[PDB]
Amino acid sequence: SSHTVLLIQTSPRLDSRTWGDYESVTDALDALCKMFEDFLSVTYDVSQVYEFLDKLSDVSMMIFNRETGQYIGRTRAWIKQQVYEMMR
């Protein structure tokens, strides 16, 4: 398991920058879809999550790497690839 920070900015305001942290990448991705599901409040296809992540002004993850004891920055594209695999 890798401690994960989820960093988001929802509008162009710098004051919309928020973060959450999680004991697992799984927990962080789970947390991110829940954000999307609440905006949705229904089913949805991958395209809809993709569009949701595109409309964020900034979204990334910083994920603990045991080899280095340091965090790797992951992009929105990386995040969408994992969301896709959560849904295949």
Add this chain to the structure above:
Amino acid sequence: SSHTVLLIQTSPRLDSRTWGDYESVTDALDALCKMFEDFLVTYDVSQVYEFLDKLSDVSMMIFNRETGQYIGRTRAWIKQQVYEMMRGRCQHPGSKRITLNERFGVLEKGYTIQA
């Protein structure tokens, strides 16, 4: 200069979590000193430590150019850096942006973004 992400939670409410990023560690520390002054002229050492202790959460991700990855630093380390930056101003007893998404994407390709 090491790109730094500053993670803050001002109150015990989870929705007071916010972050900022900076071109150097010094800039991120300076931002904390400015937060401290905004929450207040003159101040003593104890106020700076306890301002930092009263934050529900404060930590940094500091870029390490040799690994391309970020070192995490928590409150105990931040307090010593901030004290050193603030030591000369404390009373004592006696007497246009880059998003993280884009920056991480340039990094995944083998490049750093340099101020």
